[PDB]
């Protein structure tokens, strides 16, 4: 409160120094923006003095970027029980992902030039084994969530953005040539670990926030515990975006492959796995609506959780649309004979009632637009 009047000038010099270091790192160093990824990739992708060395050998030696990708591929292919967290791999995967930028009225010429620039940036990586590396790392994670698989998925999305047909072809050829069930087993495990709206977690978070501020912010924890509801929504969106980009452009071969892997000893139906996740998410959203139905106005935190769930649902709908569009008749049949209709029925119920409820207060216009 007021009378205590805790001034910074009374702190001992070393306590003040530590506080200053924390604050300075948080506000000045962290906020600084340095873009070295493009320069790094450009420097690493250059062979040196090839003519002087007279590399007349038909098989040219890999350049530094190629060797880096090969090293990470070897690490992924090593036979181990689990994939150890590797700060080096995570950093270089982030660098490679950032190297592919994915950047009013834009002229047709400008749009085509941007597409070509992105294609060149993605070819820099997929000409050096990046696609196979991504597949190998996903397989090696063995269904365990974490920073390694998050970085792998982000890299895959970066090299697949725009529906890169060449990358899709390389990935499909690698998968069909290796014939390993590990990749889709890992994908299925990750999809099953993906989370949905949790009302017990929501109530716990509300109570934690309600807990008041008695002591000083340093001594107290500021109740800044990470989000408890849909804490991995970014990972879920990345996983389903990767699956969508595998089929973007109506790639019939890979659309069929996602349903049935003919060459493998066992097959996993990723279309049905996606439908099952959508059903879980729909049930969670229906629970949230029932929780809020009696209340007159949805508060800020409830709106935020609704919005996160709706973004995830949007991504899942886009993934299913990509699976079936073209059309892939096999995928159309597989979806028609699945639990998709129940999910659509539940979603229609929620949509109708949330429309009618949100229309009654203009403070929820953004939520209504998203819905």
């Amino acid at each position: 409160a007021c009378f205590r009047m805790t001034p910074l000038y009374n702190l001992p010099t070393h306590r003040a120094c530590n506080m200053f270091l924390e604050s300075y790192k948080a506000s000045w160093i962290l906020t600084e923006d340095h873009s070295f990824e493009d320069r790094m990739i450009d420097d690493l992708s250059k062979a040196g003095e090839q003519e002087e060395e007279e590399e007349e050998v038909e098989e040219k030696k890999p350049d530094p970027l190629h060797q880096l990708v090969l090293h990470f591929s070897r690490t992924a292919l090593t036979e181990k029980s689990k994939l150890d967290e590797d700060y080096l791999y995570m950093a270089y995967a982030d660098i490679m992902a950032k190297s592919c930028h994915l950047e009013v009225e834009v002229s047709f010429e400008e749009k085509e030039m941007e597409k070509q620039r992105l294609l060149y940036q993605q070819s820099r990586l997929h000409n050096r084994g990046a696609a196979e590396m991504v597949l190998q790392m996903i397989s090696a994670c063995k269904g365990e969530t974490g920073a390694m698989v998050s970085s792998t998925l982000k890299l895959g999305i970066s090299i697949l953005n725009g529906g890169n047909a060449e990358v899709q072809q390389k990935m499909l050829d690698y998968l069909k040539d290796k014939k390993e069930v590990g990749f889709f087993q890992s994908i299925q495990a990750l999809m099953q670990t993906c989370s949905v709206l949790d009302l017990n977690a929501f109530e716990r978070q509300n109570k934690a926030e309600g807990l008041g501020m008695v002591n000083e912010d340093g001594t107290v924890i500021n109740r800044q515990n990470g989000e408890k509801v849909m804490a991995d929504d970014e990972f879920t969106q990345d996983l389903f975006r990767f699956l969508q980009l595998l089929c973007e452009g109506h790639n019939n071969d890979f659309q069929n492959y996602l349903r049935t892997q003919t060459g493998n000893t066992t097959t996993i139906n990723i279309i049905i796995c996606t439908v099952d996740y959508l059903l879980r998410l729909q049930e969670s959203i229906s629970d949230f609506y029932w929780y809020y139905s009696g209340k007159d106005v949805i508060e800020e935190q409830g709106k935020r959780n609704f919005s996160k769930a709706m973004s995830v649902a949007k991504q899942v709908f886009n993934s299913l649309t990509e699976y079936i569009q073209g059309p892939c008749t096999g995928n159309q049949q597989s979806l028609a004979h699945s639990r998709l209709w129940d999910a659509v029925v539940g979603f229609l119920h929620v949509f109708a009632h949330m429309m009618m409820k949100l229309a009654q207060d203009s403070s929820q216009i953004e939520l209504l637009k998203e819905l």
Binding site: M5, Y24, A26, F36, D43, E53, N200, L211, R223
Partner: protein, 820 residues
Amino acid sequence: CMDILELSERLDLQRFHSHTLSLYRSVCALGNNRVAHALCSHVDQAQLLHALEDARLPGPLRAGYYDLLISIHLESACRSRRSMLSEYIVPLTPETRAITLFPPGRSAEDGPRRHGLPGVGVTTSLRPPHHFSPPCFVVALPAAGATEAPARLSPAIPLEALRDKALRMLGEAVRDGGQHARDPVGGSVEFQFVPVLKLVSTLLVMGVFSDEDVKQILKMIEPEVFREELEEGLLQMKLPESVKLQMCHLLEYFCDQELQHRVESLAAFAECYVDKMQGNQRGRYGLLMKAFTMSAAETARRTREFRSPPQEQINMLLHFKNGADEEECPLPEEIRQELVNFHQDLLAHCGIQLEHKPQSLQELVSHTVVRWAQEDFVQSPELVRAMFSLLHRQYDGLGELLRALPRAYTISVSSVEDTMSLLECLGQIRSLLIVQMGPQEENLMIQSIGNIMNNKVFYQHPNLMRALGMHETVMEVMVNVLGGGESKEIRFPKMVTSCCRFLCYFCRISRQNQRSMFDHLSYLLENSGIGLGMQGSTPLDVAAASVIDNNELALALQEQDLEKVVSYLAGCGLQSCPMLLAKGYPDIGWNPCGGERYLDFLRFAVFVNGESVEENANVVVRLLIRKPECFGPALRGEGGSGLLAAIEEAIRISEDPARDGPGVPPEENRVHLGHAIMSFYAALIDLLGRCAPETHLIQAGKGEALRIRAILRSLVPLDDLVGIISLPLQIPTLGKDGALVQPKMSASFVPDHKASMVLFLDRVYGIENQDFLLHVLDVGFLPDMRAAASLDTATFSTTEMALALNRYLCLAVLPLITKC
């Protein structure tokens, strides 16, 4: 005997002797300083120093002797220093105040492109010294007990002479490589360079080289880049991949020195700037108070800053990166400009703020790594990994500082000695992470834990302890010994007992410490399946300490963890204790002692600060009803005898030997089965009473609260509670002549058992009727009050039963009568 140089042609003897050297290296590996001292008698200092210089020695023997010298004399010190080299505890001394990012130079005192030579200059980060003892095999052998003597230090070897020899040999190797002879020392360039480079790297990391020595090494690496304000450098010579790996190690050391220098410069600037900021805030406060209240609202808005936490004040005062008005940030413009200039200097040093000759360490490393990768398809994965780690550090220099700062910490000059002692103890504990636990290691661990817990810096700098990761290291040691032979009765119980005393206190030191330990709850709950026979503190106690009286953490608890604990409780309620069966106790068919421990962890989770956490209480109640075996054989639906019958049967068991214990004893027979059963049921009733909902929720008529209370009322009848409360206690008496017939508290029915019944009765059923109040007073409370009053004589006043009765009356009974 023959000349050892004949092993160049006698290849079987050469192989056997090289493997003998490997065996020497391995019998002393990872801190066996006693065996290193022993090996000093088989390969003496003169032999090792002669082998270092022998140019005719076959390559395997040369490498083996270099490695043997390192293992005997330097490995332990190098490892201990390397463990500490990742933390920056900067004391606020004049040398620290003097440290600056860029060297004071004619071009400018800070800012100029030219860095100082890496690894050369003043560094103030605390690093405990090296400790060695002289080899000598005529001293009297300490005839004290085994596994208790002070740990042996590494045998000493003259370090200044060793440094000079290493430098001279490296220079000779560089010259010879430049000359390109046909008889390399050791038979190959790799066998000529790798050993001396390994020795030099070890000595560098140990930090024994002086500034002149470091300058010589830098000039050997690259004469042009590291010229001081022949011409062929190691980095520019053609070398095998192993030599490139050693060069990468040297470059790693120098890059680490640059990072440390940046951290220390930042700390020094932080000291100066924070002093200026505090001095300015003092003046602003003085002027604000002196003001004759222009506007009360203005005064309140101004003091809004000074009535805020210091961390928030600092954040507000440092929020002028993109400009700010004197109201948003009252910091003066001059003080802002100082920080702006320092930030520019830091960016320039890291290279962020913007010649084929490198001219700098960063550019040299980048060019070298890229050139190697361009020149060859590197075959060694270790070399590839080192190359690209170095390249990443060069390209992202600000990120390295950002990831290093969490491990930086400033301390006052008066804390330096105690911090050094604490660092030595932590070094010993960390060294114990690479050796199978034994008696000597157990004693060392216990002593180090005691010293740390007696050190003041442990209590005053919990953030420093967390940054050092003390809790994680101690937890890892404890879990190693626990997991090792999990089925077998775990050895070294005393070490695990200390492993709480330390950690189970670490949680209590501060809330952030509690949160950090809570982050490992599943780990502790995973390893908590064993214990009991501990008869001390346990990982389950660590788990309870993490969630104790902390509302935020109790709410952050996970249903998975609660389900794990409930499953353990179900196991305890279904199976007997193998240890008790072995010791010879009767087979009652379940494990009250373990059940009590698990119920106890649940009680802390359900109730925080004298109130029930509904979120956890409902979950716990539902899990318990879904696994009815958790209620004990008495509360079983079909064959259950009821709580009152269970307690009476337990009393009979206690009275009758041959059913209460083995009947064949350190703690007077250790476990008594009657008391164990009574304690289990008391703990269960206490847990259920604490899971009962709050009166305000009941008044508001919440459906969930009413349902939970109804479930609890159905589980426990009121008549059973009243009967247990009415059961008589054995009071101390005077028989014979002066014979105090005191009940054995640890083996009989005690008031602590009735306290839980009273708690359940008051929280679940509640007293609301005068007739019921009078009935319970007449049958259960008044007799115990009269007994406690009668035990107020001078002889019985301080008896254990009298004190227990006083505690029971003053904690359960009398408060209830006051409420009613």
